[PDB]
Amino acid sequence: MVFYLKVKVEDFGFREDMGLNYVRYRVSGLDEELTEKLIERLDEDTERDDGDLIITVFYEREYFPFGSEESKVKMADFIAREEIEMMVFLSSVLED
Secondary structure (H helix, E strand, O other), X not given: OOOOOOOEEEEEEEEOOOOEEEEEEEEEOOOHHHHHHHHHHHOOXXXXXXXXXXXXXXXXXXXXXXXXXXXXXXXXXXXXXXXXHHHHHHHHHHHO
């Protein structure tokens, strides 16, 4: 009756050439055709890998880049801020 989606960080990084932070999320359950739906709405780079889906989303000062790890004083901040970012994002879209 209800679908269960789990999104977690798989590979995070930063591009000095651009000046923004990027991170890849791991999603399982989507389909070849379904991917075209999300990739369109998000307008990001989606690709099937071993059944999972890679999504890289980076934002500059304009949208506030992801780099507030100095707060938590560890990498956990990146995965924590990134995980909730995707989870909350989707949940917020489905809930609304």
